[PDB]
């Protein structure tokens, strides 16, 4: 029949990633809803703290959206049932649109939050004069609008297509890029660029400059607490390392789908791609779940209201 599209995975691996995904589901949803609830109940912030409260709320919102939208569909239609795609052409287009708009939202929330901390810490007066709640609401609206615009090229590329051995079969319908491969390459490399490489540069450079300023303050604070400044220097590097470790293999996977032509693909690389897909999306949802912990809870002021 249409049995070529069957992906032979270990059923125990599917059970184990179901366990990891449900655990990440409950942990990420509970953490992000408690963060939004915390910044919603706590409104006694009139000064320049309020803008950073808005960015942290936006990051928690985008991570809850990534998780609740992409996670339950991805389970049933990529882990267990590889074919047929149940949801049709506009289903494919809307699913990849929501997935990538939420991914761009997360990367731009993290990048914008780092620009906000660099202003708030390394030019404290110049950020004091620039601070207004109007500019921050304009800024968050700008980054969500750019995250919606940059996911538009995943609408027309990601159509439904029947790739069965027969020309038509009820179970041969898959969800795949349908335009020619030489423009799929451009779409995926601009995806990898504007979702990894530019937020990596601004995250790494700005958190390096902030940790440099704080280690200077530790040296002139013991040369003239000091536990909390070293704690913040730890949390900046934890941000950079968690972002790298969780969103590098996902774009390595999508570039692997992008570059390797079918003359180079093997059945071994077919099975390896499916197990690697499982692993990379595990790390992707790990990013979505450990953003609220090390952006909120390791601050020692958030803990009591948490």
């Amino acid at each position: 029949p249409s049995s070529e599209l069957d992906v032979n995975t270990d059923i125990y691996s599917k059970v184990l990633v179901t366990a990891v995904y449900l655990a990440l589901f409950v942990v990420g949803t509970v953490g992000n809803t408690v963060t939004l609830f915390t910044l919603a109940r706590k409104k006694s912030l009139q000064s320049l703290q309020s803008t950073v409260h808005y960015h942290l709320g936006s990051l928690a919102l985008s991570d809850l959206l990534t998780l609740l939208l992409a996670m339950p569909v991805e389970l049933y239609n990529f882990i267990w049932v590889h074919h047929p795609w149940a949801f049709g052409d506009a289903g494919c287009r809307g699913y990849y649109f929501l997935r990538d708009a939420c991914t761009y939202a997360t990367a731009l929330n993290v990048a914008s939050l780092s620009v906000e901390r660099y202003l708030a810490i390394c030019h404290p007066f110049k950020a004091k004069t620039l601070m207004s709640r109007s500019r921050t609401k304009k800024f968050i609206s700008a980054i969500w609008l750019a995250s919606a615009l940059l996911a538009v090229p995943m609408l027309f590329t990601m159509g439904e297509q029947n790739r069965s051995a027969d020309g038509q079969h009820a179970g041969g319908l898959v969800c795949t890029p349908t335009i020619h491969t030489a423009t799929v390459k451009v779409v995926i490399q601009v995806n990898t660029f504007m979702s990894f490489i530019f937020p990596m540069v601004v995250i790494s450079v700005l958190n390096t400059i902030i940790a440099n300023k704080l280690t200077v303050m530790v040296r002139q604070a013991a040369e003239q607490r000091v536990q909390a400044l070293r704690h913040g220097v730890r949390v900046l590097r934890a941000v950079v390392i968690a972002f790298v470790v969780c969103w590098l293999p996902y774009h390595v996977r999508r570039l692997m789908f992008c570059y390797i032509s079918d003359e180079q693909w093997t059945p071994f690389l077919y099975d390896f791609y499916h197990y690697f897909y499982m692993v990379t999306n595990a790390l992707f949802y790990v990013s979505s779940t450990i953003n609220p912990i090390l952006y909120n809870l390791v601050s020692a002021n958030f803990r009591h209201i948490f």
Partner: peptide
Amino acid sequence: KKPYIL
């Protein structure tokens, strides 16, 4: 046997 999932 190129995979189809992206």
